[PDB]
Design a protein around this nucleic acid. Structure first.
Ligand SMILES: [Mg+2]
Ligand SMILES: [Mg+2]
Ligand SMILES: [Mg+2]
Ligand SMILES: [Mg+2]
Ligand SMILES: [Mg+2]
Ligand SMILES: [Mg+2]
Ligand SMILES: [Mg+2]
Ligand SMILES: [Mg+2]
Ligand SMILES: [Mg+2]
Ligand SMILES: [Mg+2]
Ligand SMILES: [Mg+2]
Ligand SMILES: [Mg+2]
Ligand SMILES: [Mg+2]
Ligand SMILES: [Mg+2]
Ligand SMILES: [Mg+2]
Ligand SMILES: [Mg+2]
Ligand SMILES: [Mg+2]
Ligand SMILES: [Mg+2]
Ligand SMILES: [Mg+2]
Ligand SMILES: [Mg+2]
Ligand SMILES: [Mg+2]
Ligand SMILES: [Mg+2]
Ligand SMILES: [Mg+2]
Ligand SMILES: [Mg+2]
Ligand SMILES: [Mg+2]
Ligand SMILES: [Mg+2]
Ligand SMILES: [Mg+2]
Ligand SMILES: [Mg+2]
Ligand SMILES: [Mg+2]
Ligand SMILES: [Mg+2]
Ligand SMILES: [Mg+2]
Ligand SMILES: [Mg+2]
Ligand SMILES: [Mg+2]
Ligand SMILES: [Mg+2]
Ligand SMILES: [Mg+2]
Lengths: 52, 252, 121, 233
RNA sequence: GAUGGGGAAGCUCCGUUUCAAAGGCCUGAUUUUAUGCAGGCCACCAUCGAAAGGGAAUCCGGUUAAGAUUCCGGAACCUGG
RNA sequence: GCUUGUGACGGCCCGUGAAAAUCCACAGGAAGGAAUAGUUUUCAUGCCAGGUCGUACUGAUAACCGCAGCAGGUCUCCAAG
RNA sequence: UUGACAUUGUGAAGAGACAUAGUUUCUUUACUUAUUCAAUGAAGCGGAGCUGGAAUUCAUUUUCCACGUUCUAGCAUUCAAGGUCCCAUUCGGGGCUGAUCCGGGUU
C-alpha cells in the first residue's frame, strides 16, 4: 500500500477509506440529533430551576 | 521414596498455566477520582471468549479524563449485558445490570459479581461462570457491608469496595455431561497439566503414601492431619467429617 | 518567596552538561597506517584454465582478493591499480578460505589486453 | 464580540479532559528526597529527649544579627594578610631586631571543636556560639551543659555555614570569643546578657522538656474536630 | 538473560519494569560557529530466541567437465538517495 | 475426471483455534502557500547506489546415525495410461 | 506449631505493690512514626470558603446534606475559547482570570 497512488487507498467522502458510508450516514445522523437534543436538554431544565 | 506428585506441581515446570490464548486479565477500572466521587461512562465494544475460562469476557472502552485517548478495560460479562451498551462505573451511578458500584450504595438484596475484597483491588470475588454475591446488610459507622459469597460463607468488606450489578455469564456450564475422555482432554488442554489422574493406590510405595500392597488398598486412614508435613498430605486433608452427606446442606 | 510549578507527576534526571573528552595524553602515539591499501586488497590474479576462459570470452578479470575486503574495496582498487573501470564485482569464498573476485570491466576495456599487460597469460 | 465566541469548557467528570494543573503535591520524588523529608518528619513524631530538644530553641534573628555583626570585626587572618604580615617581621623583626614583636597582639574569634572545648574547660572563653545543624549531634550536645557548668555564657545559633563563613571555612560547628578589644567590651557584655537570658538561664528549665510528639496535620485536624464535637455538643 | 536492586561465607541465587533521579525525536534558536539553548512532545526502560511462523522487490531463454531464480542475453521490480 | 488452488456457505466445541516488526488509511488542523506569479513530488519521465556470510554434491539397501559400502533408523514437495 | 526474649514506641479506662500520694508491671482500647500489605505513567487528599437548599429560628444561625455528565454504538487533544492586563504595536508572545483558599502527609 506504500507503492500505490493515494486514490487506491481512499474514497472521496468524509471518513473515506476508513468506515463503510452507511456507517458515516449513521454517525452524521446521530451527531446532528444528539447535538440538537443537547439544546432541548438545556433550556428545558433552565425552566426547571426557574419554576421550582 | 520418590517426591510424590503433588509436591512436584509446586516447582511448576510442566505444570504452570497455559496462559497463551487468553484475552488478558479481567479487572475493574483503577479506582480513580471519577469512580469514587461520581461515575463515568463506557461502551462494551465486544463481549468475547477467554480461553480456559467459563464465562465470557467483556471489552469495555472508556475515555481517559487526563489525556485525550481511549482506555479499554477488560470485564467479565455479567448476564444480559450487550455490545453497544452503556456501562456506568461510580459511587453516584444508577443501579442497573452491568454497572459497577460501591457496595455501600446498593440496597440490600442487590446481586453483584466480580467484587473487590479490599476496595480498589479491581475485582476478586465471584468471577466464575455463574456465581455472584448477595449484599446482606450494611453498617454505616465504620462503613462496612456484609455479603454472602458463592461458598455460602458470609463475609464483611468495606463499603467503598466495588462489585458489578448482575450475575456472571456462562450459567449452567457444569450441567452438561463431559461425556467422553476427549472433552475433558480439551477442557484441560487450555487450563493446565492436571489431567488425567493416576490413583495413588495404583502406584508403588516409592511414589505415594497409598502405593503398593498385594491388593489395592490405602492401608491406613486417609484423613490426614493439618500439621502433616509435605509428602504426607495426600487424601482427605484436615477432614472434619467424612462419608456421604446425608440430609440437607445450605448454611443455616 | 514560593515554590516550583510542576505540571507532571513524574520526575526525571535533570538534563545535565555532558562535557567532552580533552585527554591529558594520547591514545596510541602513532595512528595505524592503512590496514587495507589497494595492494593488500587484491592478492594474486587467478589463472586457472577455466579462469582465463572468462577473460577471453567474458571481459572479466579474476583476482584472489582479501577476505577482509568487500565488493566496494575490490572495485576501487582494481580501478586504481589498473587504470580500468568496473561494471560489476561478484565475489565468492573459495573452498580453501581465500576469496575470489569475478571483476567485470566495462565495455571500453579489453580485459585480455589488460591481462597480459599485468603479465599473465 | 467580533466573530469571536465564548465556549466555556466544562470540567465536571464525564466530560472534557482535565486541564494541566499543579501537581507538586503529587510528584514521585527521588528517594533521597523522600528519605530527607521522612527523616525530619520521624524526628518530630517521636518523643525527643530534653538534652536534644534543647536545640531547636535557636537564637532569634535580631539578637543574632547583632552577634554576627560583632564577631565579624574579629575574623581570623586572611591568605594575603598573613603572608603580608610575615614579611613585616621576616624583614622587620629579624633585622631591625624586635622580640618577634613588631607584630601587634592578635584579636580573633576562636573556632574548631576541640579548640573551643579546652577553652570552655579553662574558663577562658567568654561567649560561645554552638551550631544547630551538626549531624552527629553528639559532637555538640554536651556543649550547653559544659558552658553551664563552666559558667561560660552560650547561645545556640542558626547556621553551621553562617558560622563557617565568618571564619573562612565552609562550615564551622562552633565560634568563640575569648579576647575582645576594650572598645568592643561594651557591645559584648550587652550580648552576653540577652543571650544568657534565653539560654544559660532557661537551661535548667529546658532540661525537663521532651520535644516532639507532633501529629501530621491530616491527623492533627482529625482529632481537632473529634475533640471539638465529642465534648461541646 | 544483563541492569537499579534484594539474598548468599562464597562460586553465585532472585527478580526483568520490578521499591530506580533509567532516555531521544523534530525542527526551531546560529548567520562570532558550529551546533549551545528555546518550545512541544513520547514514558515505549535492555538484549537473545525461528535457514518450517511474520517478511520490500525477478522472470523467461541460453550457457558449464563440474555453477546458476546467482553468469550471459532480453525484459522487470523493490528499497535508499 | 485427477491433483492443487480459491469462494460463497454449513457442522463442531465446558476446545472458539499466536505475537511482534512492519505498511496504509482516516479524525484532527499547528502551520505554509497565488496574479505579475506562487504552491505542488502519494501523476508521468529522468539520475546515482544496494554491503556482509551461505550457494558444490549425498540425502540414503554405499556420502547421515547404528564399530561397516549393516535387510535397522532417519522430516518433507512434485506424481502419467 | 506453641511460649519467652529481642525488633517495641505514644496515650486513656481497669487491675497490680513501699503497705489508700505514683516510679513500675500487666488485661482492655486508642495513637502513627517503626515494621506490614495494596494501587497508581504517585491526579485531584485533608482542612477552610463561596453558592443552593432541606432544616426550626427561641435572637440569628445552632446545624445537616448537597455544591456540572444517564432516551441514542456520534463528537471531546494544540498551556482553551471568552474576559482583562502588558510588549510599544507585526507576525508573534507573555501574565492573570476562566479553574476560589490554606497544608506540600501520593492514596
Ligand atoms: Mg478509490
Ligand atoms: Mg480502485
Ligand atoms: Mg506463567
Ligand atoms: Mg498429562
Ligand atoms: Mg484416575
Ligand atoms: Mg481419578
Ligand atoms: Mg502397580
Ligand atoms: Mg512411602
Ligand atoms: Mg502414612
Ligand atoms: Mg497400598
Ligand atoms: Mg481397592
Ligand atoms: Mg573480447
Ligand atoms: Mg555471494
Ligand atoms: Mg582584621
Ligand atoms: Mg537472571
Ligand atoms: Mg533476534
Ligand atoms: Mg524466517
Ligand atoms: Mg536455465
Ligand atoms: Mg564456471
Ligand atoms: Mg547442478
Ligand atoms: Mg541480468
Ligand atoms: Mg536493461
Ligand atoms: Mg525512490
Ligand atoms: Mg498433498
Ligand atoms: Mg469461528
Ligand atoms: Mg489500508
Ligand atoms: Mg512517484
Ligand atoms: Mg549502513
Ligand atoms: Mg544446488
Ligand atoms: Mg541434491
Ligand atoms: Mg548414493
Ligand atoms: Mg557413517
Ligand atoms: Mg543400511
Ligand atoms: Mg495514586
Ligand atoms: Mg503560534
Amino acid at each position: 500500500y506504500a507503492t500505490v497512488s493515494k486514490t487506491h487507498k481512499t474514497v472521496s467522502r468524509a471518513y473515506g477509506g476508513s468506515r463503510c458510508a452507511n456507517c458515516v450516514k449513521e454517525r452524521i445522523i446521530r451527531a446532528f440529533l444528539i447535538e440538537e437534543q443537547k439544546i432541548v436538554k438545556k433550556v428545558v431544565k433552565e425552566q426547571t430551576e426557574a419554576a421550582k | 521414596g520418590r517426591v510424590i506428585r503433588n509436591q512436584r506441581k509446586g516447582a511448576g515446570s510442566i505444570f504452570t498455566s497455559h496462559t497463551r490464548l487468553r484475552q488478558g486479565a479481567a479487572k475493574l477500572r483503577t479506582l480513580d477520582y471519577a469512580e469514587r466521587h461520581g461515575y463515568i461512562r463506557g461502551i462494551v465494544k465486544q463481549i468475547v471468549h477467554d480461553s480456559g475460562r467459563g464465562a465470557p469476557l467483556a471489552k469495555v472502552v472508556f475515555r481517559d479524563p487526563y489525556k485525550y485517548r481511549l482506555r479499554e478495560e477488560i470485564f467479565i460479562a455479567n448476564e444480559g449485558v450487550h455490545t453497544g451498551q452503556f456501562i456506568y462505573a461510580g459511587k453516584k451511578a444508577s443501579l442497573n445490570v452491568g454497572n459497577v458500584l460501591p457496595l455501600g450504595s446498593v440496597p440490600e438484596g442487590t446481586i453483584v459479581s466480580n467484587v473487590e475484597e479490599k476496595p480498589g483491588d479491581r475485582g476478586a470475588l465471584a468471577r466464575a461462570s455463574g456465581n455472584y454475591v448477595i449484599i446482606i446488610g450494611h453498617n454505616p459507622d465504620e462503613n462496612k457491608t456484609r455479603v454472602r459469597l458463592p461458598s455460602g460463607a458470609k463475609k464483611v468488606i468495606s463499603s467503598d469496595a466495588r462489585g458489578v450489578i448482575g450475575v456472571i455469564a456462562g450459567g449452567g456450564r457444569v450441567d452438561k455431561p463431559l461425556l467422553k475422555a476427549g472433552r475433558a482432554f480439551h477442557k484441560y488442554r487450555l487450563k493446565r497439566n492436571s489431567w488425567p489422574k493416576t490413583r495413588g493406590v495404583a502406584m508403588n510405595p516409592v511414589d505415594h503414601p497409598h502405593g503398593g500392597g498385594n491388593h489395592q488398598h490405602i492401608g491406613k486412614a486417609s484423613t490426614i492431619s493439618r500439621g502433616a508435613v509435605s509428602g504426607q498430605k495426600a487424601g482427605l486433608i484436615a477432614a472434619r467429617r467424612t462419608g456421604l452427606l446425608r440430609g440437607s446442606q445450605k448454611t443455616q | 518567596k514560593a515554590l516550583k510549578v510542576r505540571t507532571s507527576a513524574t520526575f526525571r534526571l535533570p538534563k545535565t552538561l555532558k562535557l567532552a573528552r580533552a585527554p591529558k595524553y594520547a591514545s596510541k602515539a602513532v595512528p595505524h597506517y592503512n590496514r587495507l591499501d589497494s595492494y593488500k586488497v587484491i592478492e594474486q590474479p587467478i589463472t586457472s584454465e577455466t579462469a582465463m576462459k572468462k577473460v577471453e570470452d567474458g571481459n572479466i578479470l579474476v583476482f584472489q582478493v582479501s577476505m577482509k575486503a568487500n565488493k566496494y574495496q575490490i572495485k576501487k582498487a582494481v580501478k586504481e591499480l589498473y587504470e580500468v573501470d568496473v561494471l560489476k564485482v561478484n565475489t565468492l569464498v573459495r573452498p580453501n578460505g581465500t576469496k575470489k573476485a569475478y571483476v567485470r570491466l566495462t565495455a571500453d576495456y579489453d580485459a585480455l589486453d589488460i591481462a597480459n599487460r599485468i603479465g599473465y597469460i | 464580540n467580533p466573530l469571536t465566541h465564548s465556549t466555556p469548557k466544562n470540567f465536571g467528570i464525564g466530560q472534557a479532559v482535565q486541564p494541566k494543573r499543579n501537581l507538586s503535591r503529587y510528584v514521585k520524588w527521588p528517594e533521597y528526597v523522600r528519605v530527607q523529608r521522612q527523616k525530619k518528619i520521624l524526628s518530630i513524631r517521636l518523643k525527643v529527649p530534653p538534652t536534644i530538644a534543647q536545640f531547636q530553641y535557636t537564637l532569634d534573628r535580631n539578637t543574632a544579627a547583632e552577634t554576627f555583626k560583632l564577631f565579624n570585626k574579629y575574623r581570623p587572618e586572611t591568605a594575603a594578610e598573613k603572608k603580608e604580615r610575615l614579611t613585616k617581621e621576616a624583614a622587620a623583626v629579624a633585622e631591625g631586631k624586635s622580640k618577634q614583636d613588631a607584630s601587634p597582639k592578635p584579636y580573633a574569634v576562636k573556632y574548631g571543636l576541640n579548640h573551643v572545648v579546652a577553652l570552655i574547660e579553662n574558663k577562658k572563653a567568654k561567649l560561645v556560639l554552638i551550631a544547630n545543624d551538626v549531624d552527629p549531634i553528639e559532637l555538640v550536645v554536651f556543649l550547653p551543659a559544659l558552658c553551664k557548668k563552666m559558667g561560660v555564657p552560650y547561645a545556640i545559633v542558626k547556621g553551621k555555614a553562617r558560622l563557617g563563613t565568618l571564619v573562612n571555612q565552609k562550615t564551622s560547628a562552633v565560634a568563640a570569643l575569648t579576647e575582645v578589644r576594650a572598645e568592643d567590651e561594651a557591645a559584648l557584655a550587652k550580648l552576653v546578657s540577652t543571650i544568657d537570658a534565653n539560654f544559660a538561664d532557661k537551661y535548667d528549665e529546658v532540661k525537663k522538656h521532651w520535644g516532639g510528639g507532633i501529629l501530621g496535620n491530616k491527623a492533627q485536624a482529625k482529632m481537632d474536630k473529634r475533640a471539638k464535637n465529642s465534648d461541646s455538643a
